[PDB]
Structures are given as C-alpha cells and as structure tokens.
Symmetry: D2
Subunit: 488 residues, 4 copies
C-alpha cells in the first residue's frame, strides 16, 4: 500500500475535514493501492479561497515569469517521466510501454506549448473615429475547476491545467476516484517549479459529492469536464443552477473509420487496430465503427484476426506487453454486458468476447480483444460507446451511403478515412460531422491542434491557441475623448 | 388594429397548428395591436426541418454570395428605418426619438458589419513534419436558435441573426410575447433580400411553451438567449438536459458608474442621466449604482435634479418626447415594489417614485423618473436589477474602497469611470469586473466591440469578430502522408 | 478617334503641364485609338498634394463610411462591365470573351472583398504589468503609388487601389503607356461612387519619366509595381535613392507545370492549354515550362496539337473568338526573337512559330499559338520569360529530378502539379519554390488568396487579408502609469 | 590584448582568405582590444553554402525541437550576462551599469520570446466552394543576412537572429567593424545550445567589402539592416540590383519629446534626461528635440541643468558611473562638428560643448553632456541626427503648432508626450508620425512590441509576432477537386 492520501491545498498536503475516504484498486491484481481522503463542502470552500489568493499573485507576475515557471514544471515532468509512468500503470492498468511513451510525454508537450504562448496573448485595439477608440483585454476568469476522467489521468490533468494556468487562472482539479494518485504528484511538481501556493489545488473525492460541490460553488467561473454523456449533463445542469459558469466538455463518442474502395487493406487493418485496441480500447476518440467495402470485407476480417493474434497481454511492466486489463472491475462488467448484447442481437463474434483466463489474469480486470462483424446501424454495440476493446465492422456499398451512416449518430468526436486518392480524402472528410479527422492515420493529437466534439460529444475545445483564449474573458474598453452628448 | 399575425416558416407566413394565440398591446394606450399565433411543439419541429433544408442551400453558396444577400437586407432596413421604428414604438412604448435613431440603425450596423466579414472567415494550417500537416475548417453549427427580449426587439433579432447567418447557419428566432411584431417584419425583409427559404424562421409564442420547445429540440445546435437571470438559468438547464447545446446568454446586471473626484460634475451628471433613464430605464447595461465622492455628493444631487426636470414624457411620436412608459403593467408593478423597498429601507427619495397620472398616462404603464440617494450596499434597490427608471446614488471616500464595492456583486455586465486623468481612468477600469467598460461616456456599442457579462451577467459575447467565429465549430484535419506504424 | 485623354487629378480631368503626349494603338488594326497626355514632374507633385488633401478626408471617415463608398464603386463596375470590357479589348487586343468575363469581374471581386474587411482592420493591446500596457494602431501610409502593366490594365488598377484605399490611403496610379484608357474610366467611377477628390488620381505617361518621377517623390510612402524584372530593379533602386519607400513588386516568372506519371492526359492537356494560351500567353503566372514523363510525352504532344487546332482567332468582339493579337507590335518582335532562338537551339517546333496572315490579320500584332518540345534546361526559351503564346514541353524521368529542375530558376511566381494521388500532390507542392501553387487546375486567383513571387519573381504579396495590412504601418504606443525612474 | 579573432563558419572558428584584418579599439583608452579577420568575397560564398546546408537541417526539425534549442541559448546568455556585458563595455565604451542591465538582458528577452512562439507560426485555410479550398504555408526564406551597428552590438545580433532562426532560417551576421567581439561570442553560445552548424555564421569585416558582398549575394533571400540613413540607402540599392531581396531597415531619427502645459516639470526633465544621455546619446530612439511650452521653458532649463550636473563620468566598470565615452574617435569628431554648427548658427549653448579633459579622459573619446536651447527648426543640430549627447530645447506656444513641428521632418522613428491628461495624451500621440510612441516614459522596448520607423527612419519592423511572420514567405495552395474546364 501507500500512506493515506490527503488533499493538496495551497502548496501543501492537508487533511480533509469530511471524515470520508475511498480506495483505489490496482486493476491488474485487485489489491488496494491506497486509501484516499475525500474533499467535503468545507474543504472545497477552503480550496476556492486558497485559489483566489494564489491567482492574484500569479496574475500579477509578468507573462514571461509565468512562462518560466511552467517550463520548469515541464523539465521536472521529463525527468520524472518513468517514475510517474509506473504509478500511472499501477493505478490504471495501462501497460508501461504506453504510459512511459504517451501519458506524461504528451501531457508535458501541451504544458510546454502553452508556456511559450503566454507572451503572445493579446487584446485588440479598434479606432472608431478621431475622438474615440476601443481596446480589449483578455483577463483571467479567476478560479476555474477541472474534473478529470480515469483513462488518461495525468494527461487530462495537464491538458486542463496548462491552458488554465497559462491564461492567468488558478485551477481546482478533481481526479476520478478510480485514478486519483498522479494528480497529487502533479500538484507537488507544480509547487516545486515555483507555482504560487493555491494556483493548482487537487481535491480527490466522489463525483456525487466532491464533484458536485465544485460545480455548485458560487466563486468558480468555469468548469472543464471530461467523462461520459450522462455525467456531463448532470454537470452542465448544476453549473447553470448555482452560478452561471462557462463550461467545456469532452464526452467521448462512437467515431467512424471509413475504409475507401481503393485503400490498401494492410494499412487499413493497422489503422483499425490502433483505433480500437490501444489502452485496451479505453480512448474517447477510438474508431469503433469500422466501415469496410462489401468487396473487401472477408479479406479485411482475415487481416484483423491476423493482427489480433499479435496482441500481447501480460506483465504490465514487461517491454513487450502492449495490452492491459480495464481500469476497474465494475467497468469490465459494463463492457461484458455490451459484448453479450452484441451476441444477443446477432452480431457475428469474430474473436474474443470473453474475459482472459489463467495464471496472471484471473485476478485482473481483463477482457479479451473483441471483434464483431456483420454489424448493423441499429445494434446497441454500434450505437453506444462501450469504452472497451470491442471493434464493430460494418459493410457498405457506396460513398454517399457511408457518409450518411457515419453521421447518423448523436456523437461527433472523431472520424477517419483511409484512401490514397486526393479528391476522395478531402471530399469525404469535409462531409463528416466530427471535430477530429484523420486521413490515413489515427490518434495523433498535437498540442497545436484543437480537439473536441460535435453534437453530444462535447462543448468547446482543448489544445491549440483558441483554448488559451477560451480561458480568458474579454473586457472591452471605450475611451471617449470627445464631449459626451446627453439627450436630457 | 393589425391583421392576425402568423408564424414565419420557410419563406412564407403559415398558420400555427397549436390552436393557441396571444395578444400584444400598445403599452402607451392599452389598445390591442394584434392577435398573434403561438408556435406549438409541432410548429417548432417543422421550423427545424425547414431550417435544416435551407441551411444546406445557404452554406453551399459562396461567401461573397452570402455577403451580397445580407447587404441587400441592410439596404432595405435603411430605407424602411422610420417605418420599422414606428412599429417598434407602438409595440414597446419606447419614444420614436429613440427607435428611429438607435434600434434599426444599430441593428443594421451589426448586420452590415458581419456581411463584410464572411469572406475573411478562415481556418488554419499547422505543419507537423515534412510528411504530415493539419488544417482546420470553421464549419457552420447547423440550426441555431435565438430567444429575444422585449426592450430592443428588432436590434436583438439583428444582433443574434447577423453573425449566425454570416457564419453559414440557419436561425429560428422566438421574440418575446410582449413584442413579436418587428421580428416578423425582419423575416419578410430577409426573404426580399434573397435569403433562402428556411434560413430565418420566426416562431412567436410564450417562453414556457415555444421557448422551451426550442431549447429541448434535439437538432438545434446552439441557443442564444437575452433576458433575466432567473429565466437564463432555466434555459441553461433545459438546453443541457435534452441535447447538449452551445448556449450564449446576456442577462443584465447592476453596473457601476464611478465618478472621480476630479471629474467635471456637469459631464458626470450627463453620463449618469444617459446611464439610467434611456428607454425609460429598460436597458441591461444601465449604470444604476452611481458612485460619487462624498465631498461632491450634494452638488451632484442638485445637478441630477435639474436634469431630471428636463425629462419629457408625452406623445411617443413627438420629436421632443424622450421618455416613455414601461413595456407592461406587470413590469411597472415590479419596478414600483423596488421603489417601495427603497423607501422602507431608509434610502432618501430625491425625486420621482410614483406612477404618472392624467390624460395620456392613465392607460399606460408610466413611472416617473426616480432617484434615490444616501444608499448603502445592503439595500435591495442597490443589489438587484430593477430594469426601470431608478438611479441609486452612493457616496464613497477612496479609490480602493470604490473598486471593492463596485465589484462586490454577482453581476458583471458593464461599468464606467468619469475622470480626466490618464492614470486614474485606465488604472480603475483595469480592476473592474465587467465585460463592457466606458471611460467618460456610456452606452455606445460599436459593431466591432465584443460585449457581454462577467460572472452571473452572461456566457459568451455578442458582436466583434469573435462572435462570428463563435457561430462556427472547429474541425481539425490531419493529413498523414508517411507510412502509418501500428504497435500490434 | 477618341478625344485626347487628359490626366485625372483631384476629381476632374486636367491638362498635363508637361507639354508632352503619347499614342496608344489598337493592336488588332494598328490604328491610333487615342492621343494621351503624359504627366511631368510638376504633374506628379500636383497629384501628391491633391492626394495628401484627399487622404486626410478619406481617413477621417468611419470605416463603414469607407466600405460603403467602395461597395458603390463595385455596383457601378458590375453595371458597366460590358462597356468597360469593350474598351479593354480595343486597348489590349484581348478577346471580348475574356475581358467581359474576367478583367472587370475579378477586379471588382477584389474591391468588393476589401470593402467588407475595412471594419475588421484592428490593432493590438499588450499588457506589460499592472502599471503599464501597450496598444498598436494600424495607420495609413498616406500617399502610395501604383504602377500597372499592360496585360490586365483595369484588373491591376483595381487590385492595387482596392487594398490601398481600403486601408485609408490615397493612391496615384500610373497605367502602362500601352494601355492607359480603362484606368481613366476607373477614376471617373470612383468619384461617382463618392470617393473624396484626390484619393485616386491617375497619371498616364511613360515609364522613363512619369514612373520614375513617382518613385523619386519624397512624399510617397510606398510603390506597388507590376511588370518585368529589368524594370523592377530600376524601380527599387530609384525608390531607395530618393526616399526610403516600402516597395511591393510582382515581376512575372517561368512557372513550372508538373504532370505526374498517374495523371489523366486529357486533364493535363486542358490545364497546359489554359496555363499557356489564355490572354494569348500574356499572363505572369503562365506555366510555360511543362514537365511531362518521358513515357507519356508522345501522347501528350498529340493531345496538345488537338487542342491548339481548335483555338479560334478572329474578330475580338465575336462570341467564339478565344485568341487575340499581342498587345503591341514591339512586343511581337520580342516574342518572335525568342521563338527564333528556340529554333536555332535545337528545340523541335510542334506548331505555330510565325505570325498569322490574311485579311483581318495582316494589320494586327498576331502570333500563332506556338509549342516547342524536346526542350532542355539550358535553352533560352526555357530560362527566360517570353510573355507570349509559347509553350515549352520538357521530358523527365524521376520525381526528385523534376523538383530540382522546376526549382532551378531565379524566378518563383507560380507552379502546379497534376495528379490524383493524395501524397504526391501535397508532397511535390510543398517542395516547389513558388508563392502560387495549383493542384489539378491553373489560373484561379481568389481575392482571399495571397499571391506573389519567391526569389526574383517579386517582393510582398497582393490579395488576402495580409495585403490590406501591408498598406498600413504599425504605431506602437506604451502607456506608463507608474513612476518613471531616471538613473541621472 | 586578446587573440586574433577569426571568422565563425559552420560551427567553428576558421581563418579568413581575404588576407585582411582590422583592429577594434577600447574607446576609453585608445588601446587595441584585438586584431580581427575580415571576410572576403570567397569567405562570404563559403558562409552561404554553410548556411544553406545548416538551414535544411534546422527547418526539418520539429517546431518544439527548435524552440528548446533557442531556450538553451537563453539559459547560457543569462548565466554569462556579466561576462558578456564586460566585453561589450570594453568594445563599445558603454558603462557596465548599462551593459549588464540592458544589452544582454533585453537581447535574451527577445530570443526567449520568439523561442516560445515557434509552435504558433501557422498558415491559413480558405474554403472557396464544396469542391475546392485553399491553404497557405509560412515557409522559411532560407538564408538571410543581418548587418549590425556599433551602439548595441549583441542586442542587435539577438534581435535580428532570434526571429530569423525561430522562423526556420539560417542567418549570416556581419557586426560593425567598430564592435565585432560579442557577435563572435554569440555564435559559440548558439553552437553550445545545439544550433546546427551553419545556422548562425558570423563574418567580421568592413561595410564596403564584407557588408556589400552580403547585400549582393544571389542566394541570400533577405537583408536586415541597422545603421544610418546614408548607408541604408546604399544597402537598399545593392539588394535590388543583385537579386530582388526583402529588406528591413532601422535607420535612426530625430525623435520629438512633447512636454505638455500640464506636465510636472521634474518628470519631464527626468524623461528628457533618459531620452538624451543614455549610452552617451548614441541611441536611435533618443528624444533629441525637446519641445517645452514657452511659459515653462526657463524653469525646465533650470531642472535639466541640475540633472546634467549629477551625471557621473568615470571608470566604466564602477557601479556609480552612468556616462561613457563615444564609441570611437572619428565619431566624436563628427559629434563635435555638429556642436560647432549649433554655436555658429546662434543656438545658445546651455552646458557642455567640449571634450572631457584630465586624468582618465585624455585617452578616451569623451564628449561632455551638451544642451542647446533657444533652438529653431532650420538649425542643423535640430534637423540632423547627431548620435551624441546633445539635447535641443525648442519653445512652442500651442498644441497644433507643436504637432506640426514635431512631424515636419523626414525622420519618423520615435516620439513621446508628457501629460497627466487622458485626452491630451492619446490625442497628441495619434497625430504624431512615428512608429514608437511613449506616454510619460521613454526607451522601454518590450519584446512583444513592434518597433520601427515611419518615413526615412526605416522599412519594416522588429520584435512582436509580426516580425516572426516577416521572416517567412507565404505559399498559397489551391486544391481543385472539381472538373477543370478549359475554354480551348
Ligand atoms: N438583459 C436584458 O436585456 C433583459 C433583462 N430582463 C430582466 O428580466 C426581468 C424579468 O422580466 P421577464 O420579462 O420575466 O424576463 P424573461 O427573461 O423571462 O424574458 C426574456 C425572454 O425569455 C423568454 N423565456 C421565458 N421563460 C422561458 C423559458 N422557460 N424557456 C425559454 N424562453 C423563456 C421570454 O419569453 P416570453 O417573454 O414570451 O414569455 C422572453 O422571450 C426584468 O425585470 C429584467 O430585470 C428582461 C428583459 C431584458
Ligand atoms: N539607427 C542606429 O541604431 C544607428 C545609426 N547610426 C547613424 O549612422 C551614422 C554614421 O555612422 P556609421 O558607423 O558610418 O554608420 P553605418 O550605417 O555606415 O554603419 C552601420 C552598419 O552598416 C555597415 N555598412 C556600411 N556601409 C555598408 C555597405 N555599403 N554595405 C553594407 N553594409 C554597410 C557598417 O559596416 P562597418 O561599420 O563595419 O563599416 C555597419 O555594420 C551615425 O553617426 C548615426 O547617425 C549609426 C549606428 C547606429
């Protein structure tokens, strides 16, 4: 185990006053990783007052002073990458081959990106006439709150806190109860870099209590939320009911991967694999509806089975392991229910469809890599996000049809097309109703590229210059140098 | 009386299927202006399907083709300015001296502004490496909805529809039941200008029915709302619960006007008058907390009394009338209750405070221009938006004090300072928590200037280039020209 | 003929003070179209003082006031399209089928574009610390000068004057002595639209005198030049010697057209034709080096012969005529000397190579559509711009080879590639050293798209938002609200 | 005495092939600091070939890889600040109290600024129609050249090399022959930070040879020049004659300081001192025309004289020294000729006017702080840049007059106003024809703030986001997905 984990408020660990705790489990073993204290309503109010004090200090510094501090945190994250990756692997079940290469690396990439952009954050000046002009300021929101999810815990913490801090705000961050540990480490790293006390506070807790208290607090100006559609709606409602707060949400999706009739099927199968089985399928952007031309279906299915056979489940700290258990045993039960609905609705099971068994698997939340084919647009496994390693293969006949079917969903997060043809690639992508589109690839999310969902898959965006601006609020100032005219 | 008013769906007037109607009155006389049909749930759905069809036509046109159509609508609005202003005066009670100079003039200014910006709406391109790059598209949201308020009916309709249409969307607009007439005229004008059928539909109705159906419809991508905080919270809740929607809101405020100790008091009194009694006080941005240095309070009060004596209530079509009734008898009743609370809480009534009486007033919702002084921060008239002709004068001693008291409010819409001193003007304005700040002036809202509230006064902004962009959604597209590598 | 043409200064036609005139010829007949007065040094000084006076009036107007006037000029140009096109046909020899479809249409497109962008021209604001901030203004340069070329007289006049006027400057425009007439008509149209006197003055004259006097005047802030490299070098030198002027230049090129190995040869031939024989080959961006794979060369050569045979020379006002004489007889001799160098250097002449003869041609400056093949990179016709209807076809073997050869030139204006392959199209284009690149097309120049040359083909850009900004100069203004510290 | 200084080409010091050397002097003692090799024509050719090779390596790296390398160079400059400042004091004669606080600090500030902006350098995407779109790339120019001046040697090298390198170019930098030493040190620091060989090459030499060879070289795409007007015109001419090159120029000025009638005269005098006597008056932006209201002139003269009496000339490494000799003895002779013209033209010599004498001064190029008053606009010392410690005080009567007189000059670099009045400060500044304007301050040049001259004081700008963009060239790319239509 680890010592009982405390709250982090104003540059130090402090005990919760709630009297409540929870446990986080190692999903590879079922063993308790740590007992964690849960922030109560009074603890949340403490954190907001701490953040208000720290934010004032932070915003009064020069832009380049803020940039240097965030850059030092980047340097620490690079140094402690391997230590942090192993902790993430213990908490989430994702293989170290992933966590040591992606989670902190791309989280730190976004922090490094925003650190350099702070000096470029500018207002505007508008001349109206010789005797009057307008200028604008991009002012901090003040105190903002982030609510993270459990699939990429420290990456999500960095992607929310980086633009928020770079824009001059303090952030109160609540990690998922499933994966609270790396956020507490991130808080220590920020302070070590010189972040003022209160600018990044971490309140572990339960969604129904700690998360709700944050969304209801009158002095929080913005909520940024990552999670499921059901919880996003609850969060949106409560943020409105209490104090009108700006809101950003990434809510996952059912993203389509379109294989064109002129695609190389080895490339298409490779893209489909990476779009479905990285992080054991627990990725919001996964391409879980794979549209394949009817003429290619059988050959494509063979190619998928060939690659699924190369998936190497095992010791999560082993170099060659590239597949892990799911994040929790309750989550596995939900994935298994989806798999059974696929069977009961007549989807053809091509591989997988059960838990993994044997020594080293019986005690972990393992689900075998699963592929259904002969799927149809009305099936539950095609319509609903599963967030596990479950690929659905759908046949199609013509380009206009496949565009219609890809777009006929309430989700809108990602999409992709596989084709060597110039006109086909751009033509199809431009008609797809998704915010993140990949041509002949999948999954890369550069710091420069805004990402977020259409329709029910999200509100607002993350990454890119625009997200730095979305963590400021515009103040317009008119200077009137002429004589003011009253009609009274 | 006018003929019965119908819904406007797909380029024509059409009868509602709800079987329901309401009446709009002339608030200066009590006479019924028109019987108006109310959109039902089925009428809303037809409007959404009409809008979906028209939006596709509109978005497929070239940017300059769209710009030319909106410019033709500007020309028509300029030509009919006086006719539309007279109708607005009949429906709202605002003097023709206001409506003929401001309402259509500034509504059309914003439409004209956005029409010219359509060809400048651009995405981005981000090079990643020799073998891969990203580009973004600013795509239309699709069908958006606007919900208007009754104080500036056609201006609000133009400020909401202009960026939405310019961004390639269709808008369904619901005017306040108090003031539905000019929105219907605007719909005709857009069609005359060549706007494709369905791109601007107008659904009169009640907030509890027609407005709610819009916020709940699954195929509406964004809601833009103007009104009060209480109704704003309900709109946000329904918008989230039904189908996740982008929401923008302007919700009024209690904006502070800070008179510096070196201000010319004639200028200060003139600004305060224009900040409290224009449109009979029914303006969201009004400077209803007037902070005056204690050493000049008595002289300032004298100057206010002189100018209040010049307020001219009378025939709304007479050139010298500069004060009208309130929009309705219920709204006046609410204003009168606030006035009574001021008296009962010990504020000193400097002038006004009662209904107007006599021939020409008995049938209208007229309230005398009212000024309270000796006010304190805990009083109801100081803490709550009244939305009538009620000024609160508060004394202060020092600059740090007045900034603290100006900011000690849940509202955040506007603010202003009166001072000839360079350092004082910018120094104070930069510390004020408001989205719209005026130096030595009040009320001017250029099309170029983003305007909106801090804190509980709103979400998002209107006008300026940023609001055009806010009616698009970003699609990020990565072109991967190198060979894709899978780890499976 | 026509009345003798005068100078246009301060809103009226005025006699030149030079005592000098020149003649413009109808290149289809050899007859004198008009005698035109030539601006002397005193005429230039008068135009500058007029421009200085008009610029002050123009810049004092509101941005939207400027926008409306330029939009009124657009409306007049659309209405007078056919009248202006016939005048352009008489002066240039370009077929009416071109001038009535392109010259005025696209000139007005750019004016219309910039008219709408005037209100979006904004400075910036940069906070330094609580006690100091910076804001910038985008101020007019003042009086700028444009020097036009003879191939697209009225389009060039519009592409230079539109951003200059839209940015708040006055422009003095000197058309080529070969084609002075449409610029004078434009001056009348601008005044009719409400442009203040002096904001657009037109000075016909000779390059060696009027053009040089413009480049030397101390009170002209910027020169914009279109023409050949030889004259371009003189302009930059004289502008530097006299008054440090900002200088923009578009100087033509030897643009490469790359036909890929997987290109449809009918498409390639159509693109090659439009890249070489529009406006009788007198287009700066023409793709006069056509690179074709050796394996396709014989078939491509046949397809070109088929298309050239359909070219229709004849009455320039006839609907089916699509090929005209050259702009002048001196230019034809220059074009013929180049054709002869092609013959003497061993290029294989596929068609043309001589003047056209017979009734309707003996009196005009006609050169037959001419194609050389078997060209090599050391030939005079491949290295130097001819600016007549002379296509050079070059064979190539490998992709890296064609890129090196395409880039092995001091010119850098345009380039294109023909290929259906996604990777090949973008991969090749990213490596070509040209400012204007076309994929599966040629010649389209949207107002939104910045265009200009690399290397010796120009300096700066035209069109797009950036060219509007390039006609302003930045003023940075620091407001220091804190106490200034001196070390003395 | 130091070792003979060599050229720096491709990541190492290398001997020149010119057979030529020069000496740099310590202007405080007249002694030779070092013998320095002069780059010949062949050395320039080698440096270009080195730069072409290194540029390709540098531009192929990721944006963040480049950002990290420049940030490492920042770290070394901060660490070596005092060492570099001491070298600069020895080479230039500027007091260590200046060089250790400003030269490297603000040079490194600009490098640090641009390092963070590399990831934000983006092109655009413009949709034309469903079947076609445009995107733009911001490509490196390639090899650019910077030519420095002797007053701020290492700052100028950093202000030029930072945006050029951050934009992906290689730069060949030629320092002034008066002050070559710190540029060679900077090259070593860049290599130590990981800059690829060839990306920053340094060629000491003479303007007439090394400088001219750079401006004439066909494979250099851009020249950035700092110096005097006379040499700038030569540079502009040669850049055009050889190969059409882009040119940026900062050429000094005669900047006005306008003291308003409501100004505190101690503040005005302090600003005037810092505007005239920092770096012994050798600053391009110095406010050498000080306009004072006639009614305040006598008292202002008293306050200037008192402050001049406090100037402390002496040992340049002593903490309290705040005044140094001029950079060279030839430059002192030129300054003394200007002083004599002031005397002979009837200006009243208020103080100074001679060399400093005595132990510690006879061997240095010292000129006493000099103030003239009763100046008139036609005097040589009022019209020409002196670049020494010579203030000219001019009386004025009214605001319109002083604006007219401030602007009646061919220079346009800087300007300032001293006033506590909001309207006066902005109103006056907006009318001044200068690129750099200070309100109630002088001299601060934040990295975010674009700086450069109007009129004869320069072309283009330095610092700010726009200067990063100015070191790229735009490529516009149209993708045509529809069928191309030929008229042939
Ligand atoms: N910021 C501003 O510009 C304005 C602020 N106010 C403030 O609001 C106070 C109350 O006035 P009131 O007229 O009740 O204001 P509301 O905010 O209720 O009315 C504004 C608009 O919202 C609509 N609306 C009301 N309820 C709903 C709902 N559940 N769903 C969707 N739309 C709805 C109304 O429809 P309908 O009116 O047809 O019922 C109207 O079109 C005023 O005293 C003032 O303080 C009011 C108007 C303007
Ligand atoms: N704006 C500013 O910051 C500065 C302005 N000045 C002004 O310039 C005046 C003259 O001083 P001076 O030293 O002659 O200034 P220059 O402008 O001649 O020197 C500036 C730089 O230009 C170089 N240079 C000179 N001639 C050429 C050429 N033909 N081709 C290329 N590069 C060339 C110089 O080389 P090198 O010095 O090695 O000969 C030096 O590197 C000063 O009195 C002052 O008024 C001077 C310095 C700074």
């Amino acid at each position: 185990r680890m010592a009982e984990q405390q709250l982090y408020i104003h540059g130090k660990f402090v005990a919760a006053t709630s009297g409540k705790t929870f446990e986080t489990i190692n999903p590879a073993t079922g063993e308790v990783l740590a007992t964690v204290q849960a922030a109560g309503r009074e603890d949340v109010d403490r954190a907001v007052k701490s953040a208000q004090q720290g934010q004032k200090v932070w915003a009064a510094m020069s832009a380049m002073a803020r940039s240097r501090i965030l850059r030092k945190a980047v340097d620490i994250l690079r140094e402690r990458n391997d230590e942090l990756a192993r902790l993430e692997t213990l908490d989430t079940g994702k293989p170290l081959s992933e966590t040591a290469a992606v989670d902190i690396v791309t989280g730190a990439d976004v922090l490094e990106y925003y650190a350099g952009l702070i000096p470029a954050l500018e207002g505007s000046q508008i001349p109206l006439r010789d005797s009057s002009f307008v200028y604008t300021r991009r002012e901090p929101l003040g105190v903002v709150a982030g609510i993270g999810a459990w699939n990429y815990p420290i990456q999500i913490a960095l992607w929310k806190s980086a633009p928020a801090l770079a824009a001059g705000n303090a952030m109160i961050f609540k990690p998922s109860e499933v994966t609270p540990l790396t956020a507490l480490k991130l808080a220590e790293i920020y302070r070590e870099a010189g972040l003022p006390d209160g600018v990044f506070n971490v309140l572990p807790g339960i969604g129904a209590e700690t998360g709700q208290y944050l969304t209801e607090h009158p002095d929080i100006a913005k909520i940024s939320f990552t999670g499921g559609v059901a919880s996003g709606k609850k969060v949106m409602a409560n943020s409105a009911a209490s104090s009108l707060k700006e809101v950003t949400m990434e809510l996952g999706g059912k993203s389509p991967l379109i294989i064109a009739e002129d695609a190389n099927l080895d490339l298409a199968a490779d893209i489909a694999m990476m779009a479905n089985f990285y992080s054991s399928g627990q990725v919001c952007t996964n391409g879980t509806r794979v549209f394949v031309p009817a003429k290619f279906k059988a050959e494509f299915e063979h190619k998928i089975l060939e690659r699924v056979g190369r998936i190497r489940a095992g010791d999560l700290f082993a170099d060659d392991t590239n597949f892990g258990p799911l994040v929790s045993f309750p989550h596995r039960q939900n994935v298994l229910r989806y798999i059974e609905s696929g069977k009961s609705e007549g989807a053809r099971l091509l591989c997988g469809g059960d838990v993994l068994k044997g020594e080293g698997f019986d005690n972990g939340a393992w689900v075998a890599p699963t592929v259904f084919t002969d799927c149809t647009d009305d099936m539950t496994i095609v319509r609903e996000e599963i967030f596990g390693p479950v690929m659905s293969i759908l046949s199609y006949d013509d380009e206009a049809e496949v565009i219609r079917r890809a777009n006929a969903t309430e989700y809108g997060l990602a999409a992709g097309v596989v084709t060597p043809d110039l006109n086909r690639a751009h033509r199809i992508i431009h008609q797809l109703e998704a915010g993140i589109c990949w041509i002949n690839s999948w999954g890369e999310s550069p710091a420069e590229m805004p990402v977020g969902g259409y329709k029910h898959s999200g509100i607002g965006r993350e990454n890119g210059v625009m997200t730095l601006q979305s963590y400021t609020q515009v103040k317009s100032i008119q200077v009137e140098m002429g004589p003011f005219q009253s009609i009274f």
